[PDB]
Amino acid sequence: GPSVFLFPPKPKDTLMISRTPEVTCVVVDVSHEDPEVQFNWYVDGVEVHNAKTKPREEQFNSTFRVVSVLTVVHQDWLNGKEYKCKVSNKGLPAPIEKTISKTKGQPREPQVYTLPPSREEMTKNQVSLTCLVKGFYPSDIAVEWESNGQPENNYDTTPPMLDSDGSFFLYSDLTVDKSRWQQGNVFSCSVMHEALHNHYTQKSLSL
Amino acid sequence: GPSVFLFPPKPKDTLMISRTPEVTCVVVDVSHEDPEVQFNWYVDGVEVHNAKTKPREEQFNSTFRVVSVLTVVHQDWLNGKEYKCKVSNKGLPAPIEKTISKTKGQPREPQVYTLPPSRKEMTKNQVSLTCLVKGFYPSDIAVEWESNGQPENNYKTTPPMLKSDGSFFLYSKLTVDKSRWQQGNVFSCSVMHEALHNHYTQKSLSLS
Numbered sequence: 001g002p003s004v005f006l007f008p009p010k011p012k013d014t015l016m017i018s019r020t021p022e023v024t025c026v027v028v029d030v031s032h033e034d035p036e037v038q039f040n041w042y043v044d045g046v047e048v049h050n051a052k053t054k055p056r057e058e059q060f061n062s063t064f065r066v067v068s069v070l071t072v073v074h075q076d077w078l079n080g081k082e083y084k085c086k087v088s089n090k091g092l093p094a095p096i097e098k099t100i101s102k103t104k105g106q107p108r109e110p111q112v113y114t115l116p117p118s119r120e121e122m123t124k125n126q127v128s129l130t131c132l133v134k135g136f137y138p139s140d141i142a143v144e145w146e147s148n149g150q151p152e153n154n155y156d157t158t159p160p161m162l163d164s165d166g167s168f169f170l171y172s173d174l175t176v177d178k179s180r181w182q183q184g185n186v187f188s189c190s191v192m193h194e195a196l197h198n199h200y201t202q203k204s205l206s207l
Numbered sequence: 208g209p210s211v212f213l214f215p216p217k218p219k220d221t222l223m224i225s226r227t228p229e230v231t232c233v234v235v236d237v238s239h240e241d242p243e244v245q246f247n248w249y250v251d252g253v254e255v256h257n258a259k260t261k262p263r264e265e266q267f268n269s270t271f272r273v274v275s276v277l278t279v280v281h282q283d284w285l286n287g288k289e290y291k292c293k294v295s296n297k298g299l300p301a302p303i304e305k306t307i308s309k310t311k312g313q314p315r316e317p318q319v320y321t322l323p324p325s326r327k328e329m330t331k332n333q334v335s336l337t338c339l340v341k342g343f344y345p346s347d348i349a350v351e352w353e354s355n356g357q358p359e360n361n362y363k364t365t366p367p368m369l370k371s372d373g374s375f376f377l378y379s380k381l382t383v384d385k386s387r388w389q390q391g392n393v394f395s396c397s398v399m400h401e402a403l404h405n406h407y408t409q410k411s412l413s414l415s
């Protein structure tokens with residue numbers, strides 16, 4: 001019958017005041033015969049009631065997927081509270097329960113380095129601006145590129161990857177018209193992470 | 208009833224002739240009643256009898272997992288032959304057929320650039336030498352580091368990531384004693400990819 005997956009909030013959403021983090025409870029394999037799904041949510045054992053239920057999503061294997069979204073308080077999540085989704089459905093012998101909470105372990109501060117494009121790339125029309133973020137723990141992090149206080153269009157950040165020492169690193173690749181780089185514009189890598197002062201730092205790069 | 212997952216060879220294995228590439232057919236959710244599985248393998252529709260099967264192994268959810276491994280010839284994979292695994296089990300209405308082949312699509316040549324450590328990282332006892340490989344397709348690739356013609360093995364390489372324009376990129380980070388960098392040693396990044404001339408390119412870096 002149905003199965004349940006419980007997902008943590010987006011890293012950026014738990015670190016920034018402008019964002020509202022969410023805990024997401026997904027029920028798959030809901031059969032067309034028993035479509036009513038019931039959610040009960042608990043923060044550290046105490047039932048809460050601010051959850052919302054998305055439009056049901058039909059799937060191509062002839063099943064529904066039903067999703068309940070629970071907004072959480074930033075500091076609750078960062079302090080280690082446990083979030084419990086309990087799912088009831090007539091297609092289940094017993095209700096299913098899943099619990100999620102912040103990843104544990106000694107936090108460690110990202111080191112952020114910006115690297116200009118290789119000289120050998122200078123023959124091309126577009127060049128690559130590189131942000132190396134290493135040494136951090138846990139792996140939840142967010143990395144962006146901006147110029148003149150506005151976010152950039154053409155950049156990609158690799159998923160974090162485990163390093164030798166049990167910390168994580170990643171790279172972010174910003175693709176930029178060589179003209180923009182040559183005029184002298186300043187470009188900025190912004191890193192958001194729970195172990196930074198104010199959850200935020202920024203490093204800049206120009207010619 | 209059983210499900211089947213069919214896995215391609217490891218990228219490095221398809222490119223180096225010192226390595227033996229393999230396709231792996233994994234069957235999970237095999238019940239205690241009906242525990243016997245038969246595998247049939249086809250290369251371009253033609254049945255081969257080459258596969259080697261791993262004894263069934265019980266999981267902690269009471270089901271079995273059974274694995275068939277087929278050795279593949281580097282050139283057949285590179286040329287796009289289709290490998291078909293057919294799984295027969297009594298707990299199944301009809302056998303399950305799964306097929307895999309090299310990723311189709313216009314190959315594109317990797318651009319390889321090496322990047323020295325940040326100015327600001329030189330304050331540390333170990334520095335990162337970066338190797339950026341971008342613009343390549345398909346995703347199968349291999350990356351290594353050498354100095355003075357011997358392997359440097361203190362590196363991590365990210366999985367390929369998909370870019371906007373359909374090409375892939377990755378980064379490889381080699382960590383060295385700052386002393387070794389400052390002493391002017393030459394380090395090199397070796398990339399192996401089907402769209403490079405002779406499937407190989409190499410790019411070096413040294414302190415200016």
Ligand SMILES: *[C@@H]1O[C@H](CO[C@@H]2O[C@@H](C)[C@@H](O)[C@@H](O)[C@@H]2O)[C@@H](O[C@@H]2O[C@H](CO)[C@@H](O[C@@H]3O[C@H](CO[C@H]4O[C@H](CO)[C@@H](O)[C@H](O)[C@@H]4O[C@@H]4O[C@H](CO)[C@@H](O)[C@H](O)[C@H]4NC(C)=O)[C@@H](O)[C@H](O[C@H]4O[C@H](CO)[C@@H](O)[C@H](O)[C@@H]4O[C@@H]4O[C@H](CO)[C@@H](O)[C@H](O)[C@H]4NC(C)=O)[C@@H]3O)[C@H](O)[C@H]2NC(C)=O)[C@H](O)[C@H]1NC(C)=O
Nearest residue numbers: 003005007008009010024026028029059060061063065067
């Ligand atoms: C019918 O179809 C539905 C829908 O699937 C869709 O339709 C079909 C027809 C196909 O086309 C599908 O390809 C298509 O996607 C099927 O539903 C799928 O069911 C599987 C399980 O059967 C679920 O797998 C789990 O996936 C999570 C990751 O889920 C994220 O990433 C998916 C892409 O990889 C994405 O599809 C999901 O939507 C989800 O995306 C996230 O969504 C949240 C909330 O919206 C969002 O905040 C995130 O940003 C977003 N992220 C991304 C990247 O998009 C994965 O975590 C699970 O892995 C566990 O279980 C595996 C075994 O199943 C095991 O291999 C893993 O290692 C891992 O194991 C766990 O390990 C932990 C610790 O390591 C351990 O504590 C646990 O014990 C262990 N748990 C185990 C073993 O269960 C898992 O892979 C799909 O998410 C789900 N798809 C969707 C869209 O919901 C359905 O199964 C089909 N029915 C039948 C009968 O076939």
Ligand SMILES: *[C@@H]1O[C@H](CO[C@@H]2O[C@@H](C)[C@@H](O)[C@@H](O)[C@@H]2O)[C@@H](O[C@@H]2O[C@H](CO)[C@@H](O[C@@H]3O[C@H](CO[C@H]4O[C@H](CO)[C@@H](O)[C@H](O)[C@@H]4O[C@@H]4O[C@H](CO)[C@@H](O)[C@H](O)[C@H]4NC(C)=O)[C@@H](O)[C@H](O[C@H]4O[C@H](CO)[C@@H](O)[C@H](O)[C@@H]4O[C@@H]4O[C@H](CO)[C@@H](O)[C@H](O)[C@H]4NC(C)=O)[C@@H]3O)[C@H](O)[C@H]2NC(C)=O)[C@H](O)[C@H]1NC(C)=O
Nearest residue numbers: 210212214215216217231233235236266267268269270272
């Ligand atoms: C009973 O238990 C077994 C054993 O599980 C183990 O024990 C239990 C108790 C749990 O604790 C588990 O956590 C624990 O692992 C269960 O068997 C599992 O079954 C699931 C399916 O439910 C399989 O999931 C698939 O996994 C592959 C990835 O598989 C690799 O990675 C796993 C770790 O992530 C690893 O465990 C696997 O062994 C396997 O490892 C690879 O092995 C090969 C061969 O040797 C090797 O060459 C590789 O190097 C190696 N790789 C790694 C990383 O180590 C994943 O790709 C599948 O994803 C597809 O399906 C999902 C839906 O299930 C969907 O969400 C995904 O998006 C993706 O969907 C596909 O999407 C593409 C397009 O993107 C589309 O073209 C496809 O059509 C579409 N396919 C589908 C089906 O939608 C999938 O997640 C586990 O691999 C398997 N584990 C093992 C060890 O065999 C069993 O499920 C349990 N049964 C019950 C009832 O509980």
